[PDB]
Amino acid sequence: VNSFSGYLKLTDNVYIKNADIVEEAKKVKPTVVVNAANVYLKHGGGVAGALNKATNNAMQVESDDYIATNGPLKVGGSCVLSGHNLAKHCLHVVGPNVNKGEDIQLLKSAYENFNQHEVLLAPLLSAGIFGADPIHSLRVCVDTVRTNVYLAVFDKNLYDKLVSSFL
Ligand SMILES: O=C(Nc1ccc(C(=O)N[C@@H]2c3cccc(O)c3C[C@@H]2C(=O)O)cc1)NC1CC1
């Protein structure tokens, strides 16, 4: 049993809710919150901008030190950093950004990072300002992630359509 409340069971291991990932993280304090990161860990907008703002920019400060030491991530890759006031850890995962012309096939590799964690609070990878189809992202999630994932969806109208179109 875990403390994720009001989620909708989609499969054995994937659950979904119309909710602000910032609020879910603050309420649940999950072991892992997933950030929709880019390879430079520049948390300017979308989920990343919102999570970083909620940490009062501490996420960005930590991220800048990480990049200065290690260099950029790979598209499809990830790193584990602090969850600050949101979670124990933040798993920064880089889905392909279609608005930058990146290969959508890398979306499955991006979701494979979730399998290294037994339970996660997460956004749909490559959705929103990343420019991929959220219905496609949900399908790849369900077909790739085997650990227990709680997906928070900011947009109410998108949530309604993700539920009604899910196979
Ligand atoms: O600012 C915040 N939260 C905050 C939460 C999510 C987002 C965000 O970018 N959502 C995206 C969106 C929007 C529309 C369609 C989409 O496919 C997507 C994908 C993605 C998502 O839903 O995962 C931005 C901000 N909270 C402060 C306290 C009030």
Please state the domain extents for the chain.
Answer: 14-150
* Class level of CATH domain 14-150: alpha beta
Q: What is the DSSP string of 18-51?
A: ES-HHHHHHHH--SEEEEE--TT----SHHHHHH
- What is the rounded radius of gyration, in angstroms, for the C-alpha atoms of the chain? 15
CA of 152 relative to ligand 1 center, distance in Å: 9
CB-based pocket (< 6 A), ligand 1? 20-22, 46-47, 50, 123-124, 127-128, 134, 153-155, 158
Lookup: tokens for 92: 């920064």
Distance of CA 147 to the CA centre of its chain: 14
| Burial 44-82, CB ≥16 within 10 A → b, else e | eebbbebbbebbeeebbebbeebeeeeeebebbbbbebe
Specify the resolution in Å: 1.0
Closest residue to atom 2 of ligand 1, CA basis? 50
Residue with tokens 């959220």: 134
Q: How was this structure determined?
A: X-ray
Give 65's Cβ-side CA count (13 Å radius). Answer: 7
What is the DSSP track for 55-100?
TTTHHHHHHHHHHHHH-PPPTT-EEEEE-TTT-SEEEEE----GGG
d(CA 67, CA 80): 13
**Which has the closest alpha carbon to 79: 87, 71, 155, 54?**
71
Q: Rounded to whole angstroms, how far apart are CA atoms 124 and 122?
A: 7
Task: Using the mean position of ligand 1's atoms as its centre, give its distance from the Cα of residue 128 in Å.
Answer: 7
